[PDB]
Design an enzyme around this catalytic site. Sequence first.
Site, PDB file in Angstrom:
ATOM      1  N   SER A  49     -11.691  11.437  -3.362  1.00 22.99           N
ATOM      2  CA  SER A  49     -11.000  11.148  -2.265  1.00 22.99           C
ATOM      3  C   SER A  49      -9.770  10.634  -2.429  1.00 22.99           C
ATOM      4  O   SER A  49      -9.158  10.596  -3.163  1.00 22.99           O
ATOM      5  CB  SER A  49     -11.905   9.806  -1.622  1.00 22.99           C
ATOM      6  OG  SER A  49     -11.616   8.551  -2.660  1.00 22.99           O
ATOM      7  N   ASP A  81     -15.404  -4.479   9.826  1.00 19.69           N
ATOM      8  CA  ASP A  81     -16.694  -4.078   9.162  1.00 19.69           C
ATOM      9  C   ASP A  81     -17.316  -5.090   8.299  1.00 19.69           C
ATOM     10  O   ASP A  81     -18.547  -4.761   7.685  1.00 19.69           O
ATOM     11  CB  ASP A  81     -16.672  -2.845   8.379  1.00 19.69           C
ATOM     12  CG  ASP A  81     -15.987  -2.815   6.986  1.00 19.69           C
ATOM     13  OD1 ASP A  81     -15.590  -4.112   6.633  1.00 19.69           O
ATOM     14  OD2 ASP A  81     -15.853  -1.857   6.160  1.00 19.69           O
ATOM     15  N   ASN A  98      -7.593   9.314  -5.346  1.00 21.26           N
ATOM     16  CA  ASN A  98      -8.663   8.324  -6.012  1.00 21.26           C
ATOM     17  C   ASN A  98      -9.587   8.940  -6.984  1.00 21.26           C
ATOM     18  O   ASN A  98      -9.630  10.272  -6.928  1.00 21.26           O
ATOM     19  CB  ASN A  98      -9.693   7.701  -5.072  1.00 21.26           C
ATOM     20  CG  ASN A  98      -8.810   6.906  -3.978  1.00 21.26           C
ATOM     21  OD1 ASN A  98      -8.016   6.304  -4.192  1.00 21.26           O
ATOM     22  ND2 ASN A  98      -9.361   7.114  -2.887  1.00 21.26           N
ATOM     23  N   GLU A 139       0.914  -1.256   0.063  1.00 26.13           N
ATOM     24  CA  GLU A 139      -0.122  -0.162  -0.048  1.00 26.13           C
ATOM     25  C   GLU A 139       0.832   1.363  -0.102  1.00 26.13           C
ATOM     26  O   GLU A 139       0.525   2.437  -0.750  1.00 26.13           O
ATOM     27  CB  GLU A 139      -0.934  -0.099   1.291  1.00 26.13           C
ATOM     28  CG  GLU A 139      -2.050  -1.297   1.146  1.00 26.13           C
ATOM     29  CD  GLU A 139      -3.047  -0.518   0.088  1.00 26.13           C
ATOM     30  OE1 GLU A 139      -2.984   0.506  -0.536  1.00 26.13           O
ATOM     31  OE2 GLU A 139      -4.040  -1.549  -0.008  1.00 26.13           O
TER      32      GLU A 139
END
Length: 129
Positions: free
Chosen positions: A50, A101, A46, A35
């Site tokens: 974002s 999540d 992005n 990452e």
Amino acid sequence: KVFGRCELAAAMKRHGLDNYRGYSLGNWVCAAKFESNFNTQATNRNTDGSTDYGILQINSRWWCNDGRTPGSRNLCNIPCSALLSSDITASVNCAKKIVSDGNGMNAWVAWRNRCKGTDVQAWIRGCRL
Ligand SMILES: [Cl-]
Ligand SMILES: [Cl-]
Ligand SMILES: [Cl-]
Ligand code: NA
């Protein structure tokens, strides 16, 4: 700060990531490598406007506030800039919410494409843990 491999592994283990929701430490180190190349200051825009922040490239669309992602959430209740600190506490704490999540570490595209299904234990080999 650019972490060493075993330096980051030790920092993540101290903050409770080893086997967190069943993901062994090597998964988290592998994800951070691809990452951010272990760089706490990494940022990437992005296509929707974002931005991804920090060692685990956490996205302002859902997880932090950067003041320039209209209509977004701040589910970790932090400014995105906190994710760029040499101290990884904020990143780890927010990553714990993300992985909880329901989608696991599939939330990290580089983990799914470059770590999932590989020998992730290799990422902590030779480290004094
Ligand atoms: Cl591992
Ligand atoms: Cl915003
Ligand atoms: Cl899972
Ligand atoms: Na946001």
